[PDB]
Design a protein around this ligand. Structure first.
Ligand SMILES: [Zn+2]
Lengths: 263, 15, 390, 605
């Protein structure tokens, strides 16, 4: 079976900037598209299961743990729960000017541990191939690099595919993230037509991904930079303690305070 | 080596 | 399989069968690997697309999957070339199906099916139902020929009996549908209910038959609401086999003992166990009744006690081989109706007749050295007409 | 007594079911049949108890089958198991209770034991009994008075009529006690025989000896053990423990020679103290005590030499502490059974490896010697590695058309010489021997028909042995088979199964069979059971092929012949066809060769 987890980056600052701009694309349509993708995923097979996570500057909250319109009961429950919970989360939110960058690393951490919990509870007879369909919508924060890298390595070890679906911006950190675990990376430029992309590129699971034509991966610039400047550097002088990329040879690296002996 | 014969290892009946 | 059942249908019945509630989803689940993805892709398109794109949308490796999926869904007629847009009705219904618009039950199903099998076998005590009896008689697994005397069991009946419960029930329902058309019950209406289960007068009678089979149980004096059993949507073994053709079965239900006695000689019956012997007499008796060794081996394997699961193979080779040899000896002499030829003046005419018989499929066997052959009586008329025509 | 709609008897209303049936792994049928589970955690304990009180009839891998009778219950009481001591534990072990019929049967069998005891003293057999009422009501039939020679009440009985009286008492419900109190016996001085430390006793051998020596008094009975298991060692140990005069009875010259060799090898008793009462060689039988003779030696009915009269009279006069009889399956024969009454012994132990026969005279052994004390588990020995694992197989050879034509056409019994000699079986054996010969496996071909054996042997230019074969040539052929690498096959006739000490062989082909003789089948199978130095049970190094001809009476004989082996647990795999036979070149590859063989068979007459 397959356990899909959709990490929606619903950053109120950026999405409300769209709302002010009165652009055609809106967070409501984005949520509807993600809802449709989840419904189709569960449509694929009974054993398949999904989950949803919403991201905010403060925290990240799960959006998912008759036939009035003649509808399938389970997908009806999914529709109602996600709609109500997302409206609640967006309507109620404190204001903190100091912190406005969207949070994604913690959401991915919650996702990863959730997949671990499901993998433990599920019967050993059936093998579960989990996936994380990250949907970024705003620029990332510089301060989150270390934690995001740790969670990405945890995902690599645990065999989970981070399928990034960034839109309106190309986060080098997120593209680097998906490259490590081998997840696909699609940058949709036509936001109104986003859902056609998900039902074709992302929706197919790892089992059939290899035997299918999908957009080629984007080149990843694995840049390195000194802590002095944050500028690209091809030669780094790291020590045996900090393991920090530095600019030029120095008597002692500041972040270490070690008694380096010249030679 | 010293492996058992085919006709004893597996059934030779046509089924 | 259900794929076979739906494949054997016309377009006119197909589109009607694609009802809004469930059919578009039940037939979707059938789609093995790739057709599901392709359906989701061309679920929001109102413009047909060229066939070459579908052809080239699967890598060179594993293209046979693409070909088989396309052929299967062409048979289902989900789309039309229109030159590959999906059927508008199916598209709308599927969109409406995609964001648009118990412990006592299983025991009841088990008990009802067990009593049905008890009636199927010559059990003096069994549930009585004239409709069920006649339905099984016309299902092809039973023949009475005398209403006063209880119907006997035909050769196909034993083969059906030894099948596993899932396959047994599925084949039984397949025959139910085929006979539903014969009796005049609309096939589409009854079929849609089965799909709706896994998520009118004809409906009431059909539900009565299902409740008789034990798949459903109203539990409220035949109310509108029903609670399907586990079998409606669609266990450890107990037999221990020795190397001396001895079976020790931990059976308390009389059905299992009867099934074992169909192809073994019973020796002792303990409260929680029974001892039987698989002898030539019993095995050949079953083979004469119509069973073949494959069903017996499969039945013993599926009802295999956990003790013998450790050994590989589960069933001892000597037992399996002996059963197979016993069935083979019975059909050592293969009988085939035919007509022989004699006194061929010239081999050229014999060869020409042989070629004609090969073309028509009439020939069954030929002997060039002896200049003779055998033809079935059905082809005897054809070859006789050819000879008269000269 | 109650029969279901099917063949099986109904016991739903007979006995109940224990609530902890899963915990209890034992079953008890009213007829006495018991079905034990070989997968239960307490299987070993149940096995020991059920072996103590019952005799196996079928011991497959999963569910063993035992049945108890009067003799088995008497043996249990002899090893000291009281009616409660057995029935209480039987009820505890039983998962479905104990039927009242079995309860009363056990009570009656146990109580009717020990009341009548037979003790021989000063060459006189006294029927002692502490209870006098037993004799008082036992002297109803006139046979007792005519038999008798013309508390603790005892009366002397005639030597000759002992067998008749014994079988009479068995059905009279008062079994006789043959226990020998060798520990307390001053009439016959103990012999200077001791068991050297070199001899090693296997666990099953020790268990059998313990069952025989349930108490300080040795019990007279039959211990069935495989020929390769060391039954000779067990017998030597029994004699050494008895420490009194022992008379071992073989069945042939090879048997007496092997018994003497075993005595010297495993017992410290000096060579001069052992004699061979054989006509070909006499070692002063009267001089020493421990003696080895044979059934024909003692029971001979016709003329006797003067020296052999002197020896026989000495044997009759003396009293023997132990009377070992190997190959007890031949005892119920007329002449052989006369030896039991001819000689006097306190306990007559019996050893053998194939205790099976067609005529229902095996039951007579229970009273002729005693109850079957022990019967080793062949499958357990295979698992323990004491006996080489055997891949038992039955190669089906389709009969050639012409051969079948004459076979079916003639209603006479030339078929025994016909179906035993057919081209397909000839090629099958030739190919099989070739395959094993290139595999460096020792082959011991068997065939009842000497004519067929000779024809096969000449066509394959192999060293066939048979009855009238000279002893020197027999020994030369056996020595070449054991030593010479160039030769790895010997074609032995029926004489092979009688008695021999042959080298361990990796395969044993049997082209022909004497008939439906479980004795012959087991006897010939025992040859390859010789465990190798470092083999393994799962390797199936040993093989046994019983070639049969399809659609012929040989199939009936084979199926009727493998009953004892399947009862032990061996699974005979059927081989319809052999891979590589078509490619391999074999004799009788053309119709003419089969025609010549058929003509010779017809001319055989
Ligand atoms: Zn440092």
């Amino acid at each position: 079976l397959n356990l899909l987890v959709i990490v929606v980056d619903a950053n109120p600052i950026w999405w409300g900037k769209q709302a002010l701009k009165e652009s055609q694309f809106t967070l409501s349509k984005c949520i509807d598209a993600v809802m449709v993708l989840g419904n189709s995923h569960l449509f694929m097979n009974r054993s398949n299961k999904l989950a949803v996570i919403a991201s905010h500057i403060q925290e990240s909250r799960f959006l998912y743990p008759g036939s009035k319109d003649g509808k399938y009961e389970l997908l009806t429950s999914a529709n109602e729960v996600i709609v109500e919970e997302i409206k609640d989360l967006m309507t109620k939110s404190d204001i903190k000017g100091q912190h406005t960058e969207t949070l994604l690393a913690g959401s991915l951490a919650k996702a990863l541990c959730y997949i671990h919990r499901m993998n433990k509870e599920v019967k050993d007879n059936q093998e579960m191939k989990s996936r994380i369909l990250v949907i970024k919508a705003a620029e990332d924060s510089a301060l989150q690099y270390m934690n995001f890298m740790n969670v990405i390595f945890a995902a690599q070890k645990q065999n989970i595919l981070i399928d990034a679906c960034v839109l309106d911006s190309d986060s080098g950190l997120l593209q680097q993230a998906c490259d490590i675990t081998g997840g696909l990376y699609l940058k949709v430029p036509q936001m109104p037509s986003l859902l056609q992309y998900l039902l074709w590129v992302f929706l197919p699971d790892q089992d059939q991904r290899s035997q299918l034509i999908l957009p080629p991966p984007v080149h990843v610039d694995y840049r390195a930079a000194c802590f002095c400047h944050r500028n690209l550097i091809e030669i780094g002088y790291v020590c045996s303690v900090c393991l920090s990329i530095f600019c030029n040879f120095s008597p002692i690296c500041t972040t270490c305070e070690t008694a380096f002996k010249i030679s | 080596a010293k492996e058992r014969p085919i006709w004893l290892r597996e059934s030779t009946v046509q089924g | 399989n259900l794929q076979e059942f739906l494949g054997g249908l016309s377009p006119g019945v197909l589109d009607r069968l694609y009802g809004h509630p469930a059919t578009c989803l039940a037939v979707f689940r059938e789609l093995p690997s790739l057709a599901k993805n392709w359906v989701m892709r061309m679920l929001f398109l109102e413009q047909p697309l060229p066939q070459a794109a579908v052809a080239l949308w699967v890598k060179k490796e594993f293209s046979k999957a693409q070909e088989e999926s396309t052929g299967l869904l062409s048979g289902l007629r989900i789309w039309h070339t229109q030159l590959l847009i999906l059927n508008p009705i199916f598209r709308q219904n599927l969109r409406i199906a995609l964001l648009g618009g118990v412990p006592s039950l299983d025991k009841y199903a088990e008990e009802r099916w067990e009593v049905v099998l008890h009636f199927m076998v010559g059990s003096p005590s069994a549930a009585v139902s004239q409709d069920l009896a006649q339905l099984l008689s016309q299902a092809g697994l039973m023949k009475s020929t005398e209403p006063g005397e209880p119907p006997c069991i035909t050769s196909a009946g034993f083969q059906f009996l030894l099948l596993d419960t899932p396959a047994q029930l599925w084949y039984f329902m397949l025959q139910y549908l085929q006979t539903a058309q014969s009796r005049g019950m609309d096939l589409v209406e009854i079929l849609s209910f089965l799909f709706q289960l896994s998520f009118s007068d004809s409906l009431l009678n059909f539900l009565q038959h299902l409740r008789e089979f034990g798949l459903v149980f109203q539990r409220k004096r035949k109310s509108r609401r029903y609670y399907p059993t586990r079998l409606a949507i669609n266990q450890p073994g107990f037999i221990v086999v020795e190397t001396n053709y001895r079976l020790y079965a931990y059976t308390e239900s009389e059905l299992q003992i009867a099934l074992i006695a169909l192809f073994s000689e019973m020796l002792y019956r303990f409260p929680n166990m029974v001892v039987a012997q698989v002898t030539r007499e019993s095995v050949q008796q079953a083979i004469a009744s119509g069973i073949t060794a494959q069903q017996i081996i499969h039945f013993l394997r599926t009802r295999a006690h956990p003790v013998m699961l450790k050994q590989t193979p589960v069933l001892p080779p000597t037992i399996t081989d002996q059963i197979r040899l016993w069935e083979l000896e019975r059909d050592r002499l293969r009988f085939t109706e035919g007509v022989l030829y004699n006194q061929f003046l010239s081999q050229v005419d014999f060869e020409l007749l042989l070629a004609h018989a090969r073309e028509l499929g009439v020939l069954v066997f030929e002997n060039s050295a002896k200049r003779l052959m055998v033809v079935t009586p059905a082809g005897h008329s054809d070859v006789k007409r050819f000879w008269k025509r000269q | 007594t109650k029969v279901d709609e099917y063949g099986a008897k109904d016991y739903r209303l007979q006995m109940p079911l224990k609530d902890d049936h899963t915990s209890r792994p034992l079953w008890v049928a009213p007829d006495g049949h018991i079905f034990l589970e070989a997968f239960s955690p307490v299987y070993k304990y149940a096995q020991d108890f059920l072996v103590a009180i019952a005799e196996p009839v079928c011991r497959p891998t999963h569910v063993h089958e035992y049945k108890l009778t009067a003799y088995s219950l008497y043996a249990a009481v002899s090893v000291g198991l009281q009616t409660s001591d057995i029935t209480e534990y039987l009820r505890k072990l039983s998962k479905t209770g104990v039927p009242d019929g079995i309860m009363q049967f056990i009570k009656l069998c146990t109580v009717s034991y020990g009341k009548v005891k037979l003790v021989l003293k000063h060459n006189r057999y006294f029927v002692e009994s502490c209870h006098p009422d037993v004799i008082q009501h036992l002297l109803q039939d006139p046979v007792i008075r005519e038999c008798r020679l013309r508390q603790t009440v005892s009366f002397e009985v005639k030597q000759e009529m002992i067998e008749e009286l014994q079988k009479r008492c068995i059905h009279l419900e008062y079994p006789l006690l043959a226990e020998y109190d060798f520990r307390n016996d001053s009439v016959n001085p103990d012999i200077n025989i001791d068991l050297k430390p070199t001899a090693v006793l296997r666990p099953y051998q020790e268990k059998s000896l313990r069952k025989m020596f349930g108490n300080g008094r040795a019990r007279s009975g039959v211990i069935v053990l495989p020929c390769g298991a060391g039954k000779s060692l067990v017998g030597v140990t029994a004699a050494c423990t008895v420490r009194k005069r022992c008379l071992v009875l073989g069945n042939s010259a090879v048997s007496v020679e092997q018994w003497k060799a075993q005595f010297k090898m495993w017992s410290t008793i000096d060579d001069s103290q052992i004699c061979r009462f054989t006509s070909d060689a006499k070692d002063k039988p009267i001089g020493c005590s421990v003696a080895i003779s044979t059934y024909s030696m003692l029971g001979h009915t016709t003329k006797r030499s003067w020296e052999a009269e002197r020896v026989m009279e000495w044997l009759k006069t003396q009293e023997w502490g132990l009377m070992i009889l190997d190959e007890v399956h031949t005892i119920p024969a007329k002449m052989f059974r006369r030896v039991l009454t001819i000689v006097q012994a306190h306990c007559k132990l019996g050893l053998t490896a194939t205790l099976v026969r067609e005529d229902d005279k095996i039951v007579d052994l229970n009273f002729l010697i005693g109850p079957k004390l022990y019967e080793a588990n062949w499958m357990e020995l295979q698992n323990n590695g004491y006996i080489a694992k055997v891949q038992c197989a039955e190669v089906w050879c389709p009969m050639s058309p012409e051969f079948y034509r004459e076979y079916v056409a003639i209603k006479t019994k030339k078929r025994i010489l016909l179906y035993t000699m057919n081209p397909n079986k000839f090629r099958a054996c030739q190919f099989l021997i070739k395959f094993h010969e290139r595999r460096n496996d020792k082959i011991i071909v068997f065939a009842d028909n000497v004519f067929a054996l000779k024809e096969y042997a000449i066509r394959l230019n192999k060293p066939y042995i048979y009855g009238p074969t000279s002893q020197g040539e027999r020994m030369q052929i056996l020595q070449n088979f054991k030593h010479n690498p160039k030769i790895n096959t010997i074609f032995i006739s029926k004489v092979g199964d009688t008695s021999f000490d042959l080298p361990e062989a990796n395969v044993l082909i049997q082209i022909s069979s004497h008939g439906g003789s479980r004795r012959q089948e087991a006897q010939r199978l025992g040859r390859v059971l010789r465990a190798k130095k470092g083999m393994v049970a799962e390797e199936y190094n040993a093989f046994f092929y019983s070639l049969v001809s399809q659609d012929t009476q040989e199939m009936a004989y084979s199926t009727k012949r493998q009953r004892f082996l399947v009862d032990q647990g061996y699974s005979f795999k059927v081989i319809t066809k052999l891979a590589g036979m078509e490619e391999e070149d074999l004799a009788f590859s053309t119709k003419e060769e089969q025609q010549q063989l058929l003509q010779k068979v017809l001319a055989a007459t």
